[PDB]
Structure 1
C-alpha cells in the first residue's frame, strides 16, 4: 500500500520512469491552451462586429436627431429655454420624417406593435405631467395632485407641430420610435448579415424642475434572422475543441475517482476531513470546471453562428473565463519543483492569516465606503455611487488619482466650508491609515509566509 500511495504523488517524469506511463494529460493541456485561445480570438471577430454595429448606429442617431449635438457633450447636453426645447423636439421629429433622404444608412420604419405606438404609427411623442399642478412661488403656495398623466401624439412615417407643453408641471417628454437595418459588415467575416431592430428613446428630463432639462438618446438592439437572404472551417475547429475538452474531462474524472478510492483504502488501513482532502487534486477540479465552461461556451457559440441565439456577451464571458482557466491550469505541473512553485506555496501558507486580517480590515473599509458615499457623493463626482466609491478608495490605497480626488473638493472650500473640512479629514485619515498601516501589514503577512517556505 505504501508503494501505491507513494506512486500516487509522484511527478509525471517520475511516474514515467517508474511505470513508463505516457503524460497524455500534459500534451492535452498544451493542445487545449492553443485551441481554446484560437477559438476565443475567432469568436472575438464576430463579437466585435456586433458591438461595433450597435455603437456606431447609436452615435449616428445622436448626430441625426439631437439638435446641435457634438461628440463628448453627452453628460452636459441640455436645454435652458422654452424655445430651445421646442426646437429640439421638432428637430428630432423632422429628422425622423426626413431620414430616407438625408441619412447615410438605410433604415426601414416600424409601425404599430403595442404601446406606446398605435396601429399605423411609427413615432410616439409623449409628455408626462402632474394631474393637478397649481404652483405659485410668488405666494409661496402650491396645490399638487402628483398622479402622472401622459398625453402622447402619434406620427406616421412618410399635428405634432401643435404640441403645447405644460412647463410648470411637466415631468418629462419622450420620443419613441423603431428602425430596421441590416449589418452588412458581417460579409467581411464570411457570415450572413443579421437583421437589427433599434428601439430609440429620446428623453427630455424635467424631474428636477430646476430650469435645466437634460436631453439624452438611448437605443435597444434586437437581432433577428432575416427571411431568405441571398449571398453570392470554424465548425470543425469547434468540434475539435469539444473533443479535446471531453477527453481532458474524462481523464480528470478518472484521476479523481482513483484518488477517492485510494483515500478510502487509506482510511480503512488506519482503522479527519483535513487529512481526507490530501487525496483531492484541486487542480483536476479546476480542470473539470474549465472543461465544462469551455464546452458550454462552444455550444453557445455554435448556436449563435446558426442564428439560434444572440447572447454574445454571455458567450464571450464563458469563453474568456475558460481561456484564463486553461492558461492557469498548466501550473499544476510546476508544483512538483520547488524553485518553480514559490507563488503557489506562498499562497497556500499565507491565505488563512490574510483572511483573518481581512476580517478586521473589511468593517473599516465598509464604514469609510458608506460615509463617503452619503456625505461626499452629492459634491464629489467620484463618490456618486457605492461601486464608484469602492473603486475610488481602492485606487487611493494604491496611490492612484490622489491629487484630483483632493482637487474636486477645492470648489467647495468657498461654498460649503464645513463639508470641505470634513472631506480633508476623511481623505487624509483614510489615505494614511490604509496605505501606511493596513497595506504594510498585508505585505508583511505575505512576505513572512514566503520566508516560512523559503528553504
Structure 2
C-alpha cells in the first residue's frame, strides 16, 4: 500500500522509469498551449474587425452630425447660447437629411418600428421639459410641477416642420435626436468571411438637467448585428476548432480519470486508518484547474463556431472565454515544474505565505475602504480622479505603488484659492494615506512574503 501511495506522488519521469508510463498529459498540455493560442489569435482577427467597424462608424457620425466637433473635445463639447443650440440641432437634422449626398459611407434609412418613431418616421426630435414651470429669480420664487412632458417632432427620411421648433428654455430638461441607419461591414471580405448587416441606433443628447447655462452635447450609438438576406460573394477554421475541442476533451477525460484514481486512493488510505486537510492532500488542484480550463475552452470554441455560423454575435463573451482559457492553459504547465525545487520557488512560497497574507489583508482592507469612501464623497466633486468609487480605488491602488502622485496633488492646487478648507483636508488625506500604505503596509507585506520564502529556502 505504501508503495502505491509513493507512486501516486511521483514525477512523470520517475513514474515512467517505474512503470514505463507514457507522459501523454504533458504532450497534450504542450499541444493545447499551441492550438489554443493560435485559435485565440484567429478569433481576435474577427473580433478586431467588428470592433473597428463599430468605433469608426461612431467617429464618422460624430463628425457628420455634431456642428463644430473636433477630435478630443468629447467631454467639453457644449452649447452656451440659444442660437448655438438651435444651430446645432438644425445642423444635425439637416445632415441626417443630406446623408446620401455627402457621406463617404453607404447608409440606409429605417422607418417606424415603435417608439419614439411613429410609422413612416425616420428621425425623432424630442424636447422634454417640466409640466408647469414658472421661474422668477428676480423675486426669488418659483412654481414647479416636476412631472416631465415630452414633445416629439417626426421627420421622414428624404424620398430618393422641425424648423419651427420652439424650445422652452426656462423649464427645459433635455433635447434628444433619435434615428437608425443600416450599413454593411464589407471589410470582413479581407478575412474570407461573409459581411454582416449592421443597424446603428444613434442618440444625440443636448443635456440641460443642471440648468446652469451650459448644455453639453453628446452622441452615442448602439450596434445590432444581423445576417444579411441572401448575400452573394464571388468564389480550415471549422476543422481547427474541432481539433481544439478534441484535444480539450481528451485532456478533460485524462484529468478526470486521474482525479477519480486519487479519490479512490484517498478512500483506501482513510479506510486503512482504521481528518479533512489530510484528505485534501489527495486532491490535485492543478487537475481541477485543467478541467476548468478545458470546459472554458470548449464553451468558447462552441460560441466561436456559432458566431462564425452567424447564429450568435456575442463577440465580447467569446473573447473573454477564450482569453481566460488561454491564460489558464499557459499557467497549467507549471504543474510539471512543481516537481523540482529549484523551479518551484514561487508556488512553494505562495503556498506557505497565503494564510498570513490573507489575515494581514483582512486588517488592511478596512482602512483601505474607509479611505475609499471618504475620498469618494469628500474629494469626488473637486478631483477628476475621485469621481466614482471604482476610480477612487484605482487611484489609491496606484498611489500605493508610487504611481501618479504629483498629478494627484496638483489636481487640488486649483482649490487652494477658492475652497481652502477642502484643500487642507486633501493635503492631510493624501499625505497620511501615502505614508501609511507605502511605508508601513507594503513593508510588512513584503516582509511576510520574504519570511515565507526564507522558511522554504
Residue 154 of structure 1: how far off its partner (Å): 0.1
SS of aligned partner of 1:278: helix
- Encode CA deviations 1:24-50: one digit per residue, 9 max, x unaligned: 000000000000000000000000000
Distance 1:359 1:187 in 2: 54
Would you say 1:313 and 2:278 are equivalent positions?
A: no
Distance 2:18 2:279 in 1: 26
Distance 2:99 2:145 in 1: 40
Residue 271 of structure 1: how far off its partner (Å): 1.1
- Encode CA deviations 1:206-264: one digit per residue, 9 max, x unaligned: 00000000000000000000000000010000000000000000000000000000000
Point out where structure 2 has 5 or more consecutive residues left out of the alignment. Answer: none
Distance 1:399 1:93 in 2: 50
Distance 1:271 1:131 in 2: 82
- Encode CA deviations 1:139-177: one digit per residue, 9 max, x unaligned: 000000000000000000000000000000000000000
Distance 1:45 1:367 in 2: 44
- Encode CA deviations 1:350-385: one digit per residue, 9 max, x unaligned: 000000001100000000000000000000000000
Residue 116 of structure 1: how far off its partner (Å): 0.0
SS of aligned partner of 2:138: helix
- Encode CA deviations 1:285-344: one digit per residue, 9 max, x unaligned: 000000000000000000000000000000000000000000000000001100000000
1:340-355 equivalences under 5 Å are 340-355=343-358
- Encode CA deviations 1:271-294: one digit per residue, 9 max, x unaligned: 111000000000000000000000
Distance 1:71 1:25 in 2: 53
SS of aligned partner of 1:273: coil
Question: How many residue pairs get matched?
Answer: 454
Distance 1:198 1:205 in 2: 22
The equivalent of 1:194 in structure 2 is 196
Aligned with 1:221 (options 220, 223, 229): 223
The equivalent of 1:373 in structure 2 is 376
Distance 1:409 1:77 in 2: 24
Residue 386 of structure 1: how far off its partner (Å): 0.1
Distance 1:44 1:271 in 2: 56
Residue 5 of structure 1: how far off its partner (Å): 0.4
The equivalent of 1:443 in structure 2 is 446
SS of aligned partner of 2:278: helix
TM-score in terms of structure 2 length: 0.99
Point out where structure 1 has 5 or more consecutive residues left out of the alignment. Answer: none
Distance 1:37 1:352 in 2: 34
The equivalent of 1:60 in structure 2 is 60
Distance 2:355 2:253 in 1: 33
Distance 2:14 2:280 in 1: 23
Residue 426 of structure 1: how far off its partner (Å): 0.1
SS of aligned partner of 2:413: coil
- Encode CA deviations 1:61-82: one digit per residue, 9 max, x unaligned: 0000000000000000000000
- Encode CA deviations 1:114-140: one digit per residue, 9 max, x unaligned: 000000000000000000000000000
Distance 1:417 1:337 in 2: 61
SS of aligned partner of 1:125: strand
Aligned with 1:326 (options 326, 329, 337): 329
Distance 2:119 2:424 in 1: 60
Distance 1:428 1:10 in 2: 54
SS of aligned partner of 1:411: helix
Distance 2:405 2:338 in 1: 40
SS of aligned partner of 1:138: coil
SS of aligned partner of 1:443: helix
Distance 2:24 2:374 in 1: 56
The equivalent of 1:142 in structure 2 is 142
Distance 1:16 1:149 in 2: 79
Distance 2:301 2:144 in 1: 58
1:169-180 equivalences under 5 Å are 169-180=171-182
Q: Which runs of 4+ in 1 moved over 3 A?
A: none
Distance 1:112 1:186 in 2: 29
Distance 1:91 1:344 in 2: 63
